[PDB]
Design a protein around this ligand. Sequence first.
Ligand SMILES: Cn1c(=O)n(CCCO)c(=O)c2c1nc(Oc1cccc(OC(F)(F)F)c1)n2Cc1ccc(Cl)cc1
Lengths: 181, 53
Amino acid sequence: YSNPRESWDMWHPTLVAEALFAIANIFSSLRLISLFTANSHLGPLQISLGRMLLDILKFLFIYCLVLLAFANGLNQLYFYYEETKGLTCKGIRCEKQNNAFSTLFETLQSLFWSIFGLINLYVTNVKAQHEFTEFVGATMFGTYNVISLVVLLNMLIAMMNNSYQLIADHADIEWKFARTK
Amino acid sequence: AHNKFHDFADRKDWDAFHPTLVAEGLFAFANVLSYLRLFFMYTTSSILGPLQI
Ligand SMILES: Cn1c(=O)n(CCCO)c(=O)c2c1nc(Oc1cccc(OC(F)(F)F)c1)n2Cc1ccc(Cl)cc1
């Protein structure tokens, strides 16, 4: 395969090479964190973050269960209302959000981004006038937001607090062991 | 709804409080609860148990 750039297919080998180089670059530029065990002022800090990253993953499993539950519930609600209408863009990543809870992939993406507030509130109403389904979808969306933005995040903060309180005493010997390695 | 309402029309033509819409809404609520039931399976694990407890 050796033409304007917009005519390229979405799975062109050069575009895949571009994206894989980008991900390899964000993985290569994070290796300087491993270079920070030698420094005395912040080596224990980096070591402590490395300790409680495992507990972070421990809690992210529970988050993944909650995310799957609410995502497939919202998909089972809204996917009967799939529409195209010849729109310029579909999905959450448009100027105007549409078909957010359309498929399971789009629902998982839309519920993930709702933690950071980048999904507006006009995704819960349908273009039709079925008010009851709109209300129960907005209720499910608000319930998941309440969970993953009040319950689970603050549980994560308190659990991180106790974990760093526990590993603050053993941070020095851990940093010395990592620096000797 | 299967016994009573079988009028061939588009989905947007229906009433807001039709039994089919209520049935799918309660089905979605039941699905959220069914998928959230899996938290009580985590207690048998030696890793995810104490955190959920
Ligand atoms: C779950 N839930 C929800 O989904 N929606 C969106 C529905 C469609 O918009 C809501 O508006 C909504 C809601 N719970 C609500 O009261 C809370 C109860 C418990 C916790 C909470 O929050 C937090 F934990 F304290 F932070 C909020 N309210 C507000 C409300 C609205 C109407 C009436 Cl009569 C009474 C209360």
